[PDB]
Design an enzyme around this catalytic site. Structure first.
Site, PDB file in Angstrom:
ATOM      1  N   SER A   1      33.215   5.767  20.847  1.00 57.67           N
ATOM      2  CA  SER A   1      31.807   5.734  20.441  1.00 57.67           C
ATOM      3  C   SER A   1      31.671   6.435  19.085  1.00 57.67           C
ATOM      4  O   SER A   1      32.314   6.006  18.122  1.00 57.67           O
ATOM      5  CB  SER A   1      30.927   6.325  21.558  1.00 57.67           C
ATOM      6  OG  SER A   1      29.542   6.080  21.357  1.00 57.67           O
TER       7      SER A   1
ATOM      8  N   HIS B   1      29.798   2.260  29.295  1.00 54.93           N
ATOM      9  CA  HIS B   1      30.086   3.063  28.119  1.00 54.93           C
ATOM     10  C   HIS B   1      30.771   4.387  28.496  1.00 54.93           C
ATOM     11  O   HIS B   1      30.196   5.210  29.213  1.00 54.93           O
ATOM     12  CB  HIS B   1      28.761   3.329  27.412  1.00 54.93           C
ATOM     13  CG  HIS B   1      28.884   4.118  26.151  1.00 54.93           C
ATOM     14  ND1 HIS B   1      29.327   3.565  24.971  1.00 54.93           N
ATOM     15  CD2 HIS B   1      28.584   5.407  25.876  1.00 54.93           C
ATOM     16  CE1 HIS B   1      29.308   4.486  24.025  1.00 54.93           C
ATOM     17  NE2 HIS B   1      28.860   5.614  24.549  1.00 54.93           N
TER      18      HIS B   1
ATOM     19  N   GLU C   1      28.304  -1.918  27.476  1.00 55.94           N
ATOM     20  CA  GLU C   1      28.052  -0.769  26.618  1.00 55.94           C
ATOM     21  C   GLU C   1      26.603  -0.290  26.678  1.00 55.94           C
ATOM     22  O   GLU C   1      26.331   0.894  26.468  1.00 55.94           O
ATOM     23  CB  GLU C   1      28.423  -1.100  25.161  1.00 55.94           C
ATOM     24  CG  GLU C   1      29.916  -1.345  24.920  1.00 55.94           C
ATOM     25  CD  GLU C   1      30.757  -0.071  24.865  1.00 55.94           C
ATOM     26  OE1 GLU C   1      30.226   1.053  25.051  1.00 55.94           O
ATOM     27  OE2 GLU C   1      31.974  -0.196  24.640  1.00 55.94           O
TER      28      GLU C   1
END
Ligand SMILES: C[N+](C)(C)CCCCCCCCCC[N+](C)(C)C
Ligand SMILES: C[N+](C)(C)CCCCCCCCCC[N+](C)(C)C
Ligand SMILES: *[C@@H]1O[C@H](CO)[C@@H](O)[C@H](O)[C@H]1NC(C)=O
Ligand SMILES: *[C@@H]1O[C@H](CO)[C@@H](O)[C@H](O)[C@H]1NC(C)=O
Ligand SMILES: *[C@H]1O[C@H](CO)[C@@H](O)[C@H](O)[C@H]1NC(C)=O
Ligand SMILES: *[C@H]1O[C@H](CO)[C@@H](O)[C@H](O)[C@H]1NC(C)=O
Lengths: 532, 532
Positions: free
Chosen positions: B197, B437, B324
């Site tokens: 990320s 995520h 995500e």
């Protein structure tokens, strides 16, 4: 005599014709207007002056002057749509098929041919009403109307060429049916008008137009809609095109009287020779002389009439074919040809899109491309070809019709929607063209009951099933038999949006005809073009 | 002593830690910068002053000051990402796991944590590098960097708070690794940086930034990309946010010196208390203090650097998870909750879209809606929910990464792309969130080899397979073993665009990762917003 009928316009004499090892009466070439010739070219139609003695109605009339498709000389696929009689401006006649014995007061169906408002004939093999009249016990009328510049030259403000005269021709035929059909055994207050493509848009137009509404009871629209983007132009644009026509023919242009006078001296073929030169863009599915939004025939924009419910409120039955676009791509778009499977490169696809959506700025063309492109496999010539086919059919036929359907159904008294997706087994056009624009008509008119024409038994069954839906609907406002059980065609509602397939397979029911793409064409794209 | 290592900064003493019925060496909490405290708050990091004697590196360091997620108090799903040590501005330390016996010159991997540039710790259970170091025989380093205003307050023009200092913290750790890792048996010219990320975007950012390029050999980006729309702001926008932060804290605003001086007197928690109040829009997946496009760290716009090939040219390995978006919808979007299946009405869907694409004018929101709505069934709460999930994931992670991938691969020396789509069997978050995520990290770090954590055997096999790809790639620039046969991970090319799934099922190969939607996000939508 069964072949002698006395009308308000005068006596007429028909002919006994054979049909499916039986016979019925036919009254062909009956005049309903003065020959719109000489100084009457481009003018409104006048009612036919009553005649004494007997009018011979034993043979088809002349066809209206028009462009003749010679793209495939000697090819029946194309030539079956061409005029099969002499062309002449003296072409305002109608035809009537009457059951034998003559009925007393039965359902009437009036056919309005299509052909882009630039072509068409009442006299084609495929529009012969005898099979429908015999099989369903209806009085079948087919009318004629002026096409091309003759029927639709529009110089708004002038009374010599006001526009829409082709549509007034249709209305006059309907007036004549309303006044006289009773003498042929027809019931004038149970008249259903029906037509294909430009004919179906015309049907919609009489639904909208106050001057036409009282002349029929209900309507059937096949592959055509009054709001279609090809079926009407503004007053300004009609004017521009008329002036441009005169420019092509060396006319004096400094006034309407000058312009019109010049256009009237020209032989008919001179007008037809340059008719295609006045289109504003490089495009497909666009025709030079079409109805005009004149404030008389259509009191306001089509869209505002539809929103406000300013239209005849009755029952309608309408629908479309799977592959409406394929004709117009063969004739205009690069990469397409009649004798190949027309696999389309990415280049020809981009060219095709631009031709299909001629107003669009670049962003609009991008939006369309994205919507109809499989980017996992964008060099697939079959998918590019079929995607273009869909673009043309959705933009010009299906999505306009769905917008009409959705608007009409809010105020109307009954809608029935069909999706015709059977490819006729004896079609001479190539396979890639799919279920082609115009090829449900032969099923509607019962040609598959004729063995010599080489349809399958399953196609005869489908044709009878369709004729019975059409005729039963014409009689009652409902295609379904009051008592029967082989799947009811359900009513189309705003909420459920049900329609039926028309094919040889056992009939199933669906919902929301091409809603995904039509939301694109009716909601999103116009809003994108408006904001850019 | 194996636990005593002499560095250029001074001697350090590690601790022997157990791992999978074996042991290796760990050097935790090694300083690489001066404590950026007092007048140094917001400034660039200084190198740590060398020390005499032995530095105790037997316990984890403090974590950087940051917002703490208390949305689900006592819930391990969320709390496993929170700081597990005391917070302090004195937080610039790194950690090193070294195989036993100590190697001579082996592959180094440097982990850069994510957390939206507003949170993150080097010390989480899930980032413990011992399993990777032991299993793959690598030296595993994890670094720290300032987050929130502390790391990313940007008043361009000032030297007291220039912006990007959090990124300079990362670079300084990398400098320290380049200078000292050899004494721990690491090979300084075979260093792979990797992160998730914000960590993965950071990796991309060091690839772009000239000042960082020489400090590592190759890179792995997990669910993050330097060009992500959340990962950077303009100089003007950084400035606005910094001034707005001061406005929230009653600061004197008529100059930078005044503003910065005031912000430095504040306790850390005061800055964190109002940190979220400076966002320009109601939005999700947007964080207050992020890297700034300052003309120093990034000499020009990210896009022009990518087009011109102004970046380090090496091998990369990168990818994304299936879902995500689901985290950011649970935390921000109406209709979503942790203990329901979060079926979304049409109303909440429209609200969700607007939050996901905060810049968009109405037409943009329409374009997104049309692209992600099944209009055959637009009241389906599962499809609305999943469609929003896709919108957030595509816009913020997948499609930015695909644009990076496509641009990098033109100039780079080897790309390998993955799509991680296994949902861990022991995940405590609800089913609707899918493959969440951040939940590939535990597979990358080998947690599934620990039986007490209750993964399946199939998950252990997948984790080993992933660790071997990562480590082998770090060693060679290729995730594949020179000689083996259990499906090669193929190279990603511009032409073929091949990638692999990462799951428990037998590995298959695909092409053109979400190309349809990413053409929408990368080509069409920006062109629509630019022209309106
Ligand atoms: C400008 N010109 C002279 C070149 C071309 C006009 C003739 C092309 C006809 C366009 C409509 C396509 C469909 C034709 N169909 C259905 C009627 C055969
Ligand atoms: C303005 N406030 C105080 C209300 C909300 C800020 C806290 C919400 C966090 C946004 C990011 C969502 C993902 C969080 N995860 C992944 C970290 C748990
Ligand atoms: C049509 O009109 C009739 C009589 O006016 C009414 O009772 C009926 O509900 C209508 N049907 C539909 C389908 O609108
Ligand atoms: C990477 O670089 C090497 C040596 O410079 C070259 O031979 C090779 O073709 C490159 N490989 C790729 C995948 O670009
Ligand atoms: C029209 O009917 C007449 C009878 O008056 C008939 O002789 C003639 O064949 C018909 N018209 C033709 C053949 O054109
Ligand atoms: C650090 O190492 C020392 C040895 O010098 C040890 O006594 C101590 O336990 C370690 N630190 C702690 C427990 O915080």
């Amino acid at each position: 005599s069964e072949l002698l009928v006395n009308t308000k316009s005068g006596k007429v004499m028909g002919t006994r014709v054979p049909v499916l090892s039986s016979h019925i009466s036919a009254f062909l070439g009956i005049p309903f207007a003065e020959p719109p010739v000489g100084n009457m070219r481009f003018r409104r139609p006048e009612p036919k002056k009553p005649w004494s003695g007997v009018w011979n109605a034993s043979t088809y009339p002349n066809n209206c002057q028009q462009y003749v498709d010679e793209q495939f000389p000697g090819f029946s696929g194309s030539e079956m749509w061409n005029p099969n009689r002499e062309m002449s401006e003296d072409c305002l006649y109608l035809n009537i098929w009457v059951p034998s014995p003559r009925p007393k007061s039965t359902t009437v169906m009036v056919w309005i041919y299509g052909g882009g408002f630039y072509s068409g004939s009442s006299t084609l093999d495929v529009y012969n009403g005898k099979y429908l009249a015999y099989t369903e016990e209806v009085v079948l009328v087919s009318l004629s109307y002026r096409v091309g510049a003759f029927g639709f030259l529009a110089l708004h403000g002038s009374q010599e060429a006001p526009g829409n005269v082709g549509l007034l021709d249709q209305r006059m035929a309907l007036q004549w049916v309303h006044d006289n059909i009773q003498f042929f055994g027809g019931d004038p207050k149970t008249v259903t008008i029906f037509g294909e493509s430009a004919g179906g848009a015309s049907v919609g137009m009489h639904i909208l137009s106050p001057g036409s509404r009282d002349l029929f009871r209900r309507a059937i629209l096949q592959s055509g809609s009054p709001n279609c983007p090809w079926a009407s132009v503004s007053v300004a644009e009609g004017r521009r095109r008329a002036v441009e026509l005169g420019r092509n023919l060396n006319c004096n242009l400094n006034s309407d009287e000058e312009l019109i006078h010049c256009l009237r001296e020209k032989k008919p073929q001179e007008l037809i020779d340059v008719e295609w030169n006045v289109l504003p863009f490089d495009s497909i599915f666009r025709f030079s002389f079409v109805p005009v939004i004149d404030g008389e025939f259509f009191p306001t924009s089509l869209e505002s009439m539809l929103n406000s419910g300013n239209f005849k409120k009755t029952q309608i039955l309408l629908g479309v074919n799977k592959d409406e676009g394929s004709f117009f791509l063969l004739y205009g778009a690069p990469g397409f040809s009649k004798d190949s499977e027309s696999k389309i490169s990415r280049e020809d696809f981009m060219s095709g899109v631009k031709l299909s959506v001629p107003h669009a700025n670049d962003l609009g063309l991008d939006a369309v491309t994205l919507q109809y492109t499989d980017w996992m496999d964008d060099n697939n010539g079959i998918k590019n070809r079929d995607g273009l086919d869909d673009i043309v059919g959705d933009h010009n036929v299906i999505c306009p019709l769905m917008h009409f359907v959705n608007k009409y159904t809010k105020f109307g008294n009954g809608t029935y929607l069909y999706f015709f997706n059977h490819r006729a087994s004896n079609l001479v056009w190539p396979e890639w063209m799919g279920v082609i624009h115009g090829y449900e008509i032969e099923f509607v008119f019962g040609l598959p009951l004729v063995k010599e024409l080489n349809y399958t038994a399953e196609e005869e069954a489908l044709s009878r099933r369709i004729m019975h839906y059409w005729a039963t609907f014409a009689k009652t406002g409902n295609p379904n038999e009051p008592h029967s059980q082989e799947s009811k065609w359900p009513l189309f509602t705003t909420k459920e949006q049900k329609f039926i397939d028309l094919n040889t397979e056992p009939m199933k029911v669906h919902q929301r005809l091409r809603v995904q793409m039509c939301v694109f064409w009716n909601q999103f794209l116009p809003k994108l073009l408006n904001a850019t």
